[PDB]
Design a protein around this ligand. Sequence first.
Ligand SMILES: COCc1ccccc1NC(=O)N1CCC[C@H](C(N)=O)C1
Ligand SMILES: [Zn+2]
Length: 139
Amino acid sequence: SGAIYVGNYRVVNRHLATHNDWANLVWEDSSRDLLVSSTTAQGCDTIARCDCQTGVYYCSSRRKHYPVSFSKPSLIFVEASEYYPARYQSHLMLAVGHSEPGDCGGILRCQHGVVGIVSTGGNGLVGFADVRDLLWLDE
Ligand SMILES: COCc1ccccc1NC(=O)N1CCC[C@H](C(N)=O)C1
Ligand SMILES: [Zn+2]
């Protein structure tokens, strides 16, 4: 679990979105595993606008933050799950690191701000859904 709160928006993993999120839907994309809903309270996260490939992520299954090197956002094959069939997920960045189910939603940050959220894992790898291209999150 976890979310990004920026302006009047809440960014969450689409497969973990609630009834309130879908009732206040702004935008969703199954191919990215992202959903943005509207909030009544003002969010104060800064979204990074950069091509950083190093940062720090929060891993809930370890109650710890880890530094990582991560790949550029790309189309990566993701195995079938209870939420989606086997498919290419777009805008996904991989890193070598721990991640298990329950870790989705943990934030990945660089010195510029929030880069993305944990979305995939397994095999000693962790995948993050990028949010840096969503320029409208501020305006
Ligand atoms: C982050 O931990 C997830 C995980 C860790 C370790 C092993 C498997 C997973 N399961 C995982 O990748 N999926 C979870 C459900 C939806 C995800 C998606 N974006 O399509 C795919
Ligand atoms: Zn950066």
